[PDB]
């Protein structure tokens, strides 16, 4: 059974719910004192300004955290990735939290938090998000992980927040929504020779190259890299355009430029401007690159995409040729808010692999996939 | 992400 | 007022029943910075850097708010101006300062700090602005609404769309108005240094009316210490729910402005038989400078905090508390009329000061309450 | 904030 997540404030795995609010008031009193690790290890907040523990976090992400089904592909985060999703504003570096062997000192875990104010159904309130939970292969099966939450939970008590977001490859209690991953693929020779896909049978490797054929350049009139100068419409962009969803974030001006701007190798974005040179709508993608065992497939991300007057259909469209043009080999992106509609259009297909999102200290009714509108790195 | 998917 | 008609806030008069905001958050907000003056610009000044840190204090020091007759102006202490500035959650960009091109001389400057304030039935996320500063030679040159506009727009970029901040001038419109009360410690030197006066009455009999005991009378007072930090929360946090404008801190916040440090913040707290903390009393350290007086330079003046009482009677309390500062060689110690104080100013002979204390509220729509509800002590 | 005195 859930020994350790059956003594949180999350919903049981079975019951419907029918109300909002919190499962359990916040609190006037925070332990102070971290809690126990198991005899040899010791806590560590890291300081990512330092390239040495940046990379002592990269060394330990790239060799132990998430593998996929069949243990072929894991996640490359890059360091300059890392610093874009754990140094957003208004980071601490008390919620980069990792754990260390006493004696010498190795990175063996980490679980981090990031603020974030979020809106859910009628309720803004200021939540963290939580990722990149890893334990050294060499310390699983052995009570860490519920030892990182509690630490990380009891760190963000000590600033005053109560609620938590994060998503999971696992099913645990309980999520408030369920989504799929959906790929295109963008270069199919080296996709089927690595066994990410395959060829679908009664088909030929010429035949599949030409199914997923693209125009070199993008359909739409107007389509140019985002710019200083765009950070407020966009930001107006995103904000009406996620009103819609049930789940979202609420970013300030600052939390566009950080989480929009373009970055290499990390975010891209591009925006339609119109005749009138108004920006109209924008599209996002970000590079998260996975370690072939057994040398590196290069993914692009969907992350947030506003249509006022283009079609999210050609929108996308437009970000399987910019992908394709920067060397991607495949397009991943969910099945939440508005991404139902174009998924088999444009040839995206289904991955084996769920996201689950959930919600800590915080009971609600679940939703369907397309009223989630949340993308965490 | 956190969930290392591939085709199904 | 010819500037604040322009600002989202209610007009002096207009008596309000709603509850909520004036204009709606802003979906894009201004990339540029507001036009100053020819010849300056801006500076987000870096207090950790000491030279900064410096000037900033001589700054305040030479042009910061002055009493009624000009004869006393604040000291607020770089040590003192890091603990405002730099509470839990501060921005190097909310440290907003204007400089002489030329010279890179500062003349201006204006701050903003976060902080989750609760009012009537709303928790919102808030900036408290203060330190409002332009160099005398800069006086009525419009600069202050530049400043104004400014930090209001750095407060925008980060989100955050409502704000709480005081003035000794009436504003249009005050949520609350607060009398500050001020009782001797020193009366030789106040009233020398001419910050209060002989009610005839003969001033050595004078000197024995504001005598106090030589030690506190409370049982297991002693100072706070770092095992009280979870418990003073709790008190603070049930302690503050009946008033009606409050702070609602974290327990790094409460670190922050309780855990005491040497010419800056005092705190006791009472720990009884049990080992357990009952009630508190804090005050902060900040003199002011006596101008043109040839042999009297600065009076050393403590202001009133948070004070929780949950067994000790709060007149026990701030008795006490009286005694603490006096050993500390605090010449007078202040008070507002605001939360429970009026329940015991008197009995403890403070006399009534001139200058009053309203408390504003930025883009946010409520009614005025007394000051008796008020819970908020800005530094 | 305000520097009041004895009145
Ligand atoms: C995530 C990881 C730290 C799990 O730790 P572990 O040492 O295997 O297992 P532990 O016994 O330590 O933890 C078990 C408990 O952790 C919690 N848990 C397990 N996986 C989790 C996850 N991804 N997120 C949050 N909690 C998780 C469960 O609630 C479980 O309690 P339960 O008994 O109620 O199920 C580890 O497998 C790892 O680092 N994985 C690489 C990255 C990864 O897999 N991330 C999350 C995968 S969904
Ligand atoms: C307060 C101070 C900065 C005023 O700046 P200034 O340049 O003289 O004033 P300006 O030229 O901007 O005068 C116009 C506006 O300043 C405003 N102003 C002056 N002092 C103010 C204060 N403490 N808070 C808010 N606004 C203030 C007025 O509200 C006025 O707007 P209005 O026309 O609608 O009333 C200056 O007198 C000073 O340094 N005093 C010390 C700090 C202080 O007293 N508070
Ligand atoms: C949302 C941000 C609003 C910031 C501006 C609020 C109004 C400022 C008035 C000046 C306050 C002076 C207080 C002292 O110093
Ligand atoms: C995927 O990397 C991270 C694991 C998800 C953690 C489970 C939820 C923990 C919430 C912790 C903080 C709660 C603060 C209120």
Redesign the interface.
Same mark, same amino acid.
């Given at each position: 059974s859930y020994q350790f997540w059956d003594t949180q404030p999350v919903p049981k795995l079975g019951e419907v719910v029918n109300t909002h609010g919190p499962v359990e008031p916040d609190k006037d009193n925070i332990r102070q004192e971290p809690y126990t690790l198991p005899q040899g290890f010791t806590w560590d907040a890291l300081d990512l300004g330092d390239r040495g523990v940046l990379k002592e976090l990269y060394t330990l992400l790239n060799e132990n955290y998430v593998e996929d089904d069949d243990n072929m592909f894991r996640f490359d985060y890059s360091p300059e990735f890392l610093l874009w999703a754990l140094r957003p504003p208004g980071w601490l570096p008390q919620w980069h939290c990792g754990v260390r062997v006493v004696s010498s000192r190795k990175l063996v875990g980490f679980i981090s938090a990031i603020p974030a104010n979020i809106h859910i159904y009628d309720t803004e309130k200021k939540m963290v998000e939580i990722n990149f939970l890893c334990v050294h292969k060499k310390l699983r099966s052995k009570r860490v992980a519920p030892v990182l939450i509690r630490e990380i939970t009891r760190r963000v008590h000590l600033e005053g927040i109560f609620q938590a977001v994060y998503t999971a490859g696992v099913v645990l209690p309980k999520p408030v929504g369920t989504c799929r991953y959906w790929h295109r693929s963008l270069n199919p020779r080296k996709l089927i020779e690595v066994k990410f896909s395959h060829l679908s049978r009664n088909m030929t490797m010429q035949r599949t190259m030409k199914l997923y054929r693209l125009p070199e350049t993008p359909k739409t009139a107007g389509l140019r890299p985002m710019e200083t100068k765009d950070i407020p419409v966009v930001h107006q962009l995103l904000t009406r355009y996620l009103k819609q969803f049930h789940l979202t974030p609420v970013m300030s001006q600052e939390e566009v430029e950080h989480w929009f701007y373009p970055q290499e190798n990390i975010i891209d974005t591009f925006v339609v401007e119109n005749a009138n040179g108004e920006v109209t709508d924008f599209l996002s993608f970000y590079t998260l690159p996975s370690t072939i065992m057994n040398k590196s497939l290069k993914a692009a991300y969907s992350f947030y995409n506003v249509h006022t007057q283009t079609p999210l259909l050609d929108l996308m469209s437009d970000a399987l040729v910019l992908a394709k043009m920067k060397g991607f080999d495949v397009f991943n992106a969910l099945d939440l808010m508005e991404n139902k509609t174009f998924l088999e259009k444009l040839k995206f297909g289904i991955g084996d692999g769920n996201l689950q999102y959930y919600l800590y200290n915080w009971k609600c009714p679940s939703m369907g996939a397309e009223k989630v509108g949340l993308v965490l790195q | 992400? &956190?969930?290392?998917? &591939?085709?199904?």
């Open positions: - | 992400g &956190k969930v290392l998917s &591939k085709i199904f």
